Design a protein around this ligand. Structure first.
Ligand code: SF4
Ligand code: SF4
Ligand code: SF4
Ligand code: FES
Ligand SMILES: [Zn+2]
Lengths: 242, 693, 125, 117
């Protein structure tokens, strides 16, 4: 069992179950810790009723997004394992399990991370993929061989060194992992990338145009016209994540 | 009890608690897999065996999902197929493009199941390329190409659980997880050769066989191993005139699906140091000679020496077949001799356990009897060396149920906890009158294991007497449903020899032979041969016995003839000839028949069917193959043979010693093998590569 | 029971039905692979002859043979059918009864059974 | 030079034609029959024949042993033996070689040796 679910238990027993149920909506009742981090004006750690709105939580506890609500790209409700939320839908969303599951995310450990418009979303998601690659125990073949593929693809998307169909390929690569692993680390690995594809594919397309016009024409997997193998190494191509 | 479920519409009934993959196998539904194996713990890390069950939301691992009443299983859903393709796609991402150079090629499960369930093409073209893995040196028997490892942990599971060699394991985490020893250490166990078969891909491979053939060009013959007395069933893969490799085939009542390293790797001794032409000693050198010239020289030596009665001695070696022993004994009898000896020390005398009843010199509890054991006492025996697969069997029994093992004899490195009661006959007296004797009395399935090495002692009578008295007392050790008295032979031919009565007479042991005939017989010393004796050698390899001879005759090896071998269980098994004998070598019983004709005592059979008829005449259990039947004379035999005639024998004060000094070289074949020579010097105890600390 | 010689209408040599022995069996589960697709048919093939099996040509090093059946192997759907065929041809045969894996119940949970006494071995995964 | 035959007679062969290859004297595989043995066993078919006309190609073991070691920065060296001049696929399948261990590590297809520096 988690520590804070055990921690709340003595106070729950003393104060009674009904009092605890009074806070938060049905089936989502009580008060949770809400660590807040990222691009807010004052990062914080507070406890709050469940089913609070995002906007209110942010502006009341963390002095708001750095630059104001206009300057928000997205928010990750819960830790890195949960698909990222877009700006338009996160205005009205509720902090119970149910609403976040409805907008296709989850509370997780209520570790909200906010990213402003100055920051690059693809860099963040690539770093999460590197995290999951470093964190896989390597027992089951889907996770073990899939986290590294996801990292290798995310680096090329961060530089744009890819074709636009490789986005759909990457989506299917996530689906290769999702339901087939021994534990849910694989699910967690698959999810952030799917959120990224669902919400910020135009950003990936713009960065791929940046790679094509700016550097050169790219084939699938990052090969280029004069990309060859010479005396033990690949020469002629950037090779993202050397 | 047995529960019921449906798999792909069918109706299959299976024992409760079994894994779903066992149910699928029973119901005729094929499920792909890699990490699952019938003899290993369940692992569930490959994720190839996924299936859909209506209760679960996501597909479930079939090797590790327990069956339940009324379960509905679909192995053919679109989701299942997509799952298999996804799993294969991920499996092949970092697999090296090594098929033209991988020894597994043509018999690789990754190939076959990628072809049957994977996609036609691949999607992984990454400019960063694939992962690579260091190669690891784990001894001269198992070559390693770890780029190909798919991390199924079969090798780890086997080395830990089955053979009790814990040096193998997985180090690191995630992508960099490597199977190995984490430092330079040999995979040191007599069962190591089996990880070659277990590894579904070419990561672990036979090293002496490397690159020499491909599976589609091998002729497969089912035959019988003769390196030890267990009688392992093997498949002999040969192309043309030479034998390529030996791999195990299942016989759940003998070796399960395993063979030891000698049986696997001593095949290379069959293509070197071979005997191909008759040889005749002239001065201090051998000279090649024709079959007629050889046999006439034997006849002339017989007429000149003029042996009367027991002056014609016959010695049988560890490797020979039953038909050859029968021929030799019949010819020797027709010469008026009873001096049909075995090759072991003290083999000039009859064995102390007697010959009258089979149960006196056999593994009376079947090899499968070890599965039921609750207590075992080992007398002067080290099964790890004498019978490796049976040692693995004892180990498995010990792991999965409670079981008490004690031993009397040299301190033995065991894969299971043993209690040492002492090295002496007095220690055996103390034990059988002590706490472990009490343990045996209380036990439900006890069995006493006597090594063949004790039979070779002069004081064998005292040991057999003590054991027989204890057995005749304790009903648990010997009742009508369980015979706990067991002799563990080490040579493949001892059981058959005793079965046909290849035992010297009392007056024969007194005589000094003028003519000696060695059939195999490579454990012979300078002392056991009189200087004036005329020695004939008949074998397949050049060893010390052939060095001692005056005439040498080439005979076929066990891979080159269809013979009968009787194992420790008393089970009679038939082999099949993979190839024909090299050169001018001949089938052994034909050799004996022809030489007997030159000796004027012509044997009454000149055809294989007549040979089997004579064998039926000698004993009816030689012609009943793959059959074990218990003795009705269990109680009579013990009294009449072990306690009866062994009263007078005086126990010595000499401690029991190890029966075989070197596990890897014990036969002519094994001493003719470069691989066994390399293995012996590589796997020596005083070598740090085989230590751990 | 067995067709004698000289009323076989096949036209094969008499030696085939006189001094040759065939063997009938099922192929064993290969130890190298987990697949079992080859193990259900009943093969019939001929035991080798000593002098005529295979020798080495003294020119290009090839495998010469005088046994015309060394490569022949029939497939049958069932043991009784193979027996009937061999009998109808007059071939002496031997049946090698197959061996199968004895069933045992396997539980994944068994890897984590609590041990009340000293550990017999450290399972590792 | 002088090989005694099974007859007990002498067979004379020039030294140059006892070498296994023009560039190598001895065999490079245990099963490989040496030139001396070839003549001893086939001398009937070599009579009145001109040995200087026989094929005698170069032993590739030494030729690959003369090629310098390629040093690579990382842990993995990639080799495919391609022909950068002509079109199509003319190399061998592309494999990756680990060089973390001490010393040179040979490509399994072409024999080119790599080393981590
Ligand atoms: S899914 Fe879980 S068990 Fe499988 S490799 Fe990843 S972390 Fe390990
Ligand atoms: S292990 Fe199998 S798939 Fe891999 S290279 Fe060898 S034959 Fe091919
Ligand atoms: S070496 Fe073979 S058996 Fe061992 S983990 Fe790798 S693939 Fe599995
Ligand atoms: S065989 Fe079941 S998951 Fe590996
Ligand atoms: Zn190469």
């Amino acid at each position: 069992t988690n520590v804070e679910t055990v921690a709340v238990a003595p106070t729950i027993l003393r104060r009674g179950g009904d009092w605890f149920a009074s806070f938060g909506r049905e089936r989502n009742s009580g008060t949770k810790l809400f660590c807040i981090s990222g691009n807010v004006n004052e990062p914080c750690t507070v406890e709050e009723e469940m089913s609070i709105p995002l906007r209110e939580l942010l502006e009341k506890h963390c002095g708001g997004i750095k630059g104001g609500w206009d300057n928000l790209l997205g928010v990750i409700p819960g830790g890195c394992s949960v698909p990222i939320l877009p700006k338009n839908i996160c205005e009205d969303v509720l902090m119970d399990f149910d609403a976040l599951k409805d907008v296709q995310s989850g509370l997780g450990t209520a570790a909200v991370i906010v990213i402003n418009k100055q920051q690059d979303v693809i860099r963040a998601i690539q770093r999460f993929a590197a995290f999951y690659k470093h964190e896989s125990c390597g027992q089951c073949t889907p996770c073990r061989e899939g986290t590294t593929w996801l990292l290798k693809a995310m680096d090329r998307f961060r530089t744009g060194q890819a074709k636009e169909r490789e986005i759909d390929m990457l989506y299917e690569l996530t689906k290769d992992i999702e339901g087939h692993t021994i534990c849910a680390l694989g699910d967690a690995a698959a999810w952030p990338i799917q959120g990224l594809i669902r919400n910020f594919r135009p950003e990936m397309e713009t960065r791929m145009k940046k790679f094509h016009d700016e550097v050169g024409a790219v084939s699938v997997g990052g090969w280029m016209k004069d990309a060859r193998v010479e005396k033990g190494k690949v020469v002629g191509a950037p090779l993202p994540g050397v | 009890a047995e529960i019921e479920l449906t798999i792909d519409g069918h109706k299959v009934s299976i024992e409760a608690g079994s894994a779903l993959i066992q149910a699928c196998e029973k119901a005729g539904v094929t499920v792909p897999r890699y990490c699952y194996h019938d003899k290993l713990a369940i692992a569930g890390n490959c994720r190839m065996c996924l299936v859909d069950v209506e209760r679960a939301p996501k597909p479930v691992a079939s090797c590790a999902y327990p069956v339940a009443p009324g379960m509905v299983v679909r192995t053919d859903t679109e989701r299942v197929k997509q799952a298999r393709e996804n799993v294969m796609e991920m499996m092949l991402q970092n697999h090296p493009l090594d098929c033209p150079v991988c020894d597994q090629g043509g018999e690789c499960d990754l190939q076959d199941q990628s072809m049957r369930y994977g996609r036609d093409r691949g999607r992984f073209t990454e400019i960063t390329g694939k992962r690579s893995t260091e190669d690891k040196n784990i001894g001269p028997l198992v070559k390693t190409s770890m780029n190909r490892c798919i991390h199924c942990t079969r090798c780890v599971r086997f080395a830990n659980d089955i053979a009790g060699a814990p040096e193998l394991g997985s180090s690191g985490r995630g992508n960099d997880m490597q199977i190995g020893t984490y430092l330079e250490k040999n995979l040191n166990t007599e069962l190591s050769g089996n990880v070659i078969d277990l590894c579904p891909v070419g990561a672990l491979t036979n090293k002496p066989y490397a690159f020499r053939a491909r599976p589609w060009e091998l002729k497969k013959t089912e035959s019988i191993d003769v390196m030890d007395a267990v009688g392992s069933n093997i498949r002999i893969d040969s192309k043309g005139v030479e034998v390529m490799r030996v791999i195990p085939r299942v016989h759940e009542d003998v070796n399960e699906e395993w063979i030891n390293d000698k049986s696997r790797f001593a095949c290379d001794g069959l293509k070197t140091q071979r005997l191909t032409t008759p040889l005749i000693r002239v001065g201090d050198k051998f000279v090649n000679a024709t079959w007629d010239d050889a046999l006439s020289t034997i006849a002339k030596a017989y007429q000149q020496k003029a042996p009367k009665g027991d002056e014609f001695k016959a010695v049988a070696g560890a490797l020979v077949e039953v038909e050859s022993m029968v021929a030799l004994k019949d010819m020797t009898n027709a010469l008026g001799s009873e001096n049909t000896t075995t090759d072991t020390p003290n083999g000039n005398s009859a064995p102390a356990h007697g010959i009258t009843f089979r149960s006196n010199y056999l593994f009376n509890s079947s090899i499968a009897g070890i599965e039921d054991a609750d207590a075992i006492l080992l007398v002067g025996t080290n099964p790890r060396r004498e019978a490796a697969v049976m040692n693995a069997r004892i180990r498995k029994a010990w792991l999965r149920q409670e079981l008490e093992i004690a031993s009397v004899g040299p301190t033995l490195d065991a894969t299971f906890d043993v209690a040492e009661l002492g090295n002496t006959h007095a220690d055996l007296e103390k034990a059988l009158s002590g706490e472990f004797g009490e343990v045996l009395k209380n036990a439900k399935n006890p069995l006493i294991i006597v090594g063949s090495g004790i039979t070779d002692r002069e004081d064998a009578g005292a040991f057999f007497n003590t054991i027989g008295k204890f057995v005749e007392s304790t009903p648990s050790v010997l009742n009508e449903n369980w015979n706990g008295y067991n002799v563990l032979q080490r040579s493949a031919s001892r059981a058959g020899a005793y079965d046909i009565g290849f035992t010297p007479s009392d007056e024969a042991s007194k005589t000094t032979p003028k003519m000696v005939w060695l059939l195999g017989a490579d454990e012979v010393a300078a002392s056991d041969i009189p200087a004036d004796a005329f020695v004939v050698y008949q074998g397949h390899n050049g060893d010390v016995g052939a060095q001692f001879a005056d005439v040498v005759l080439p005979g076929a090896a066990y891979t080159e003839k269809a013979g009968t071998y009787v194992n420790t269980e008393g089970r009679s098994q038939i082999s099949r000839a993979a190839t024909g004998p090299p050169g001018g070598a001949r089938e052994d019983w034909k050799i004996l028949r022809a030489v007997s004709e030159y000796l004027g005592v012509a044997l009454p059979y000149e055809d294989a069917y007549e040979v089997r008829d004579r064998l039926a005449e000698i004993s009816p259990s030689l012609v009943r193959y793959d059959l074990v039947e218990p003795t009705v004379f269990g109680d009579v035999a013990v009294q009449h043979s072990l306690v009866g005639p062994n009263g007078s024998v005086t126990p010595s004060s000499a401690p029991l010693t190890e029966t075989i000094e070197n596990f890897y070289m014990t036969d002519s074949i094994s001493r003719s093998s470069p691989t066994m020579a390399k293995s012996s010097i590589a796997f020596n105890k005083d070598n740090k590569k085989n230590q751990a600390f | 029971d067995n067709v004698p010689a000289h009323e076989i209408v096949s036209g094969a040599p008499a030696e085939l039905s006189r001094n040759r022995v065939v063997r009938i069996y099922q192929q064993a589960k290969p130890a190298t692979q987990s697949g079992e697709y080859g193990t259900f048919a009943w093969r019939l093939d001929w035991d080798i002859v000593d002098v005529a099996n295979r020798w080495e040509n003294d020119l290009i090093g090839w495998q010469s043979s005088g046994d015309y059946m060394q490569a022949t192997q029939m497939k049958f759907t069932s043991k009784e059918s193979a027996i009937k065929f061999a009998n109808k041809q007059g071939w002496d045969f031997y049946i090698q009864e197959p061996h199968h894996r004895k069933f045992r119940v396997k539980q994944y949970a068994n890897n984590f059974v609590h041990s009340y006494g000293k550990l017999k071995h450290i399972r590792t995964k | 030079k002088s090989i005694i035959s099974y007859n007990g007679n002498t067979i004379e062969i020039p030294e140059e034609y006892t070498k296994q290859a023009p560039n190598r004297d001895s065999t490079w595989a245990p099963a490989q029959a040496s030139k001396t043995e070839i003549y001893k066993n086939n001398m009937v078919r070599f009579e009145q024949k001109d040995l200087s006309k026989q094929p005698m190609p170069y032993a590739g073991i030494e030729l690959i042993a003369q090629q310098p070691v390629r040093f690579v920065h990382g842990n993995t060296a990639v080799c495919d033996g391609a022909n950068h001049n002509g079109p199509g696929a003319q190399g061998h399948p592309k494999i990756f070689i680990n060089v973390d261990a001490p010393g040179s590590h040979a490509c399994q297809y072409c024999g080119t040796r790599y080393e981590k520096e």
